[PDB]
Amino acid sequence: MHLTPEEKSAVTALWGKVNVDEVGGEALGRLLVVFPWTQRFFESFGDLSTPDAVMGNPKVKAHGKKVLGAFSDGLAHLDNLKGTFATLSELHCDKLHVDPENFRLLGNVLVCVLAHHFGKEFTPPVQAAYQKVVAGVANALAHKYH
Amino acid sequence: MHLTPEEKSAVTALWGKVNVDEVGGEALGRLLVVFPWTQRFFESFGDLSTPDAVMGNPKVKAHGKKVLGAFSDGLAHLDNLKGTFATLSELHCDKLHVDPENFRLLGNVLVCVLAHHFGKEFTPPVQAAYQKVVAGVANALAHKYH
Amino acid sequence: VLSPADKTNVKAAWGKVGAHAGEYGAEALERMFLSFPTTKTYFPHFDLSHGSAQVKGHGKKVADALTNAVAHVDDMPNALSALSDLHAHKLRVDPVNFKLLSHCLLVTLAAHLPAEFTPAVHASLDKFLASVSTVLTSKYR
Amino acid sequence: VLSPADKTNVKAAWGKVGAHAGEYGAEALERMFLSFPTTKTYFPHFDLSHGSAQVKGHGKKVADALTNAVAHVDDMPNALSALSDLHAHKLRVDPVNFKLLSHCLLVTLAAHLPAEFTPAVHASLDKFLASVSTVLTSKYR
Ligand code: HEM
Numbered sequence: 098m099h100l101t102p103e104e105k106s107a108v109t110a111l112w113g114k115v116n117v118d119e120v121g122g123e124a125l126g127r128l129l130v131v132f133p134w135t136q137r138f139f140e141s142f143g144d145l146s147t148p149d150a151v152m153g154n155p156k157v158k159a160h161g162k163k164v165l166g167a168f169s170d171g172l173a174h175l176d177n178l179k180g181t182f183a184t185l186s187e188l189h190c191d192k193l194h195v196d197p198e199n200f201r202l203l204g205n206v207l208v209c210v211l212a213h214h215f216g217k218e219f220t221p222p223v224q225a226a227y228q229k230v231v232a233g234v235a236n237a238l239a240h241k242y243h
Numbered sequence: 244m245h246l247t248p249e250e251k252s253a254v255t256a257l258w259g260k261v262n263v264d265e266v267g268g269e270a271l272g273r274l275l276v277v278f279p280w281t282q283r284f285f286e287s288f289g290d291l292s293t294p295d296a297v298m299g300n301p302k303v304k305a306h307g308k309k310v311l312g313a314f315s316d317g318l319a320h321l322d323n324l325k326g327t328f329a330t331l332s333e334l335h336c337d338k339l340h341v342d343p344e345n346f347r348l349l350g351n352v353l354v355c356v357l358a359h360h361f362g363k364e365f366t367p368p369v370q371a372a373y374q375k376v377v378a379g380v381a382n383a384l385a386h387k388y389h
Numbered sequence: 390v391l392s393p394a395d396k397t398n399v400k401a402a403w404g405k406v407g408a409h410a411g412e413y414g415a416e417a418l419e420r421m422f423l424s425f426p427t428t429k430t431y432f433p434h435f436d437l438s439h440g441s442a443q444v445k446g447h448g449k450k451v452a453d454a455l456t457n458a459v460a461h462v463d464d465m466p467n468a469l470s471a472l473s474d475l476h477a478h479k480l481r482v483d484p485v486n487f488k489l490l491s492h493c494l495l496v497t498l499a500a501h502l503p504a505e506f507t508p509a510v511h512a513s514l515d516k517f518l519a520s521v522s523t524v525l526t527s528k529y530r
Numbered sequence: 531v532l533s534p535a536d537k538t539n540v541k542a543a544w545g546k547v548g549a550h551a552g553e554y555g556a557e558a559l560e561r562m563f564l565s566f567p568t569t570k571t572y573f574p575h576f577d578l579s580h581g582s583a584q585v586k587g588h589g590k591k592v593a594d595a596l597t598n599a600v601a602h603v604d605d606m607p608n609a610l611s612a613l614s615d616l617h618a619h620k621l622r623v624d625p626v627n628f629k630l631l632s633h634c635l636l637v638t639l640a641a642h643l644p645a646e647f648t649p650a651v652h653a654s655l656d657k658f659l660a661s662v663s664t665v666l667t668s669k670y671r
Pocket residue numbers: 135138139141160163164167168185189193195199200203204234238
């Protein structure tokens with residue numbers, strides 16, 4: 098990741114303040130509501146017929162937390178996202194058949210949720226570093242597609 | 244750039260058959276006709292009002308030769324596209340103000356032109372290799388943007 | 390929007406494709422799967438080996454849908470209605486993939502129509518395929 | 531297609547922005563220039579430093595066009611005809627950039643309207659900004 102030291106530092110400082118439980122459920126729920134075609138991968142989660150249904154779904158919440166836990170690992174491995182997510186990439190490709198374009202959608206939704214949560218603290222420079230991180234993670238998750 | 248040996252040989256194999264002069268002119272011209280907004284960078288080239296005016300414009304043709312001459316040189320340094328195109332990347336950014344999306348569009352138009360000239364010979368595997376190469380060149384030209 | 394000229398260009402080119410449509414659709418799919426592997430995530434239930442009967446049969450359906458769009462070029466949103474619902478609510482294919490297939494179709498036509506694939510026609514065809522993709526993607530949300 | 535509930539959501543969200551519209555416009559631009567530096571290629575004649583009067587001034591213009599769009603949500607192609615002309619024929623901005631401005635505007639709204647930026651409203655705004663982008667790039671060719 099061509100991340101600047103000041104970029105790494107800003108990403109890390111904000112992340113130490115993130116409530117993963119709240120943020121994960123919100124990001125995953127928002128992806129499914131804003132881009133409803135992504136619901137195709139989550140049929141087994143139950144009712145996803147309305148925003149409230151989605152946002153309230155406990156499987157959506159629990160899976161959100163897990164996804165964001167994985168995202169946390171990446172932040173501790175920013176100089177090697179590829180090796181960090183190699184297995185998860187293989188799994189999303191060979192077992193789950195998820196179009197990597199979805200990784201990019203989730204990334205931008207995540208940025209929107211961090212803004213919603215941190216308000217003015219999510220300054221344009223902080224956002225810029227996070228955009229690089231979400232693109233980095235998406236690319237690492239797509240790396241073992243074949 | 245994940246280019247395998249066989250990908251690389253196929254790219255080079257075909258490239259030896261190209262009349263770079265002609266092809267450069269066809270690709271640039273087609274870009275200007277198919278995606279007309281790209282004409283914003285070439286107003287000093289004169290008449291670009293109709294397909295014939297663009298395709299037969301001597302300045303379009305001469306510029307295309309220049310473009311393809313640089314591309315060929317990239318094909319001789321596939322393992323170091325970034326270094327090869329560094330000065331050109333800076334130029335297109337800092338002096339010419341060219342959105343790198345334009346490099347992507349040109350690449351895809353170049354693929355159509357190669358298909359058009361080589362017909363069958365441009366097989367699916369060969370196209371697949373050329374897609375990787377044009378994305379790599381586009382990425383190399385975009386890499387010094389800031 | 391398609392212009393009168395565009396419409397003439399598309400009818401003429403597709404008219405020359407004629408009875409080879411199905412085969413060109415099948416080749417367009419092969420080129421797509423090979424050049425843009427991420428598109429394969431939508432066809433896990435298919436045998437994607439070269440020459441596959443499944444690919445050949447699907448290429449025909451794709452080609453026939455385009456032929457129909459050309460046949461109803463002044464009423465495309467209505468002629469493609471059924472297909473737009475299918476891609477939006479059952480299949481749920483991310484919109485970026487439409488551009489990939491469109492590009493491969495064009496490459497396929499260029500490789501087979503040396504004389505017809507002039508710059509004006511290429512331009513009309515590009516707009517046509519973008520129009521078709523817009524329709525197929527219009528009911529996504 | 532914007533639904534009645536979408537229209538309601540956008541009018542509501544945009545209403546609270548009220549007098550801040552201009553500041554939010556400038557903020558969205560600054561976020562785009564920093565997050566997606568290729569967008570700067572369209573503004574070589576601007577001072578792009580933080581706090582620039584050019585950016586502020588342009589932010590207002592963008593925000594006002596957006597207010598106009600919201601006010602004419604049922605008839606966007608007509609209300610934005612001139613702007614569509616401008617972006618298509620004079621400015622000639624590559625279409626991929628509209629998604630980038632759209633995203634930054636959404637981030638700006640999220641950061642300023644925590645109460646109003648619910649999941650349903652987020653969805654409607656995303657669709658609205660996509661619709662605006664479609665109208666602005668509809669005359670490109
Ligand atoms: C930031 C990007 C993402 C990361 C880091 C991530 C991470 C994960 C992790 C850690 C798992 C658990 C795997 C297991 O142990 O079984 C998982 C499962 C899964 N992911 Fe992702 N994911 C991402 C994005 C996506 C998106 C965008 C989609 C589709 C929209 C998706 C689809 C799935 C599906 C369908 C599962 C299986 C869930 C289940 O039913 O148990 N993922 N992902």
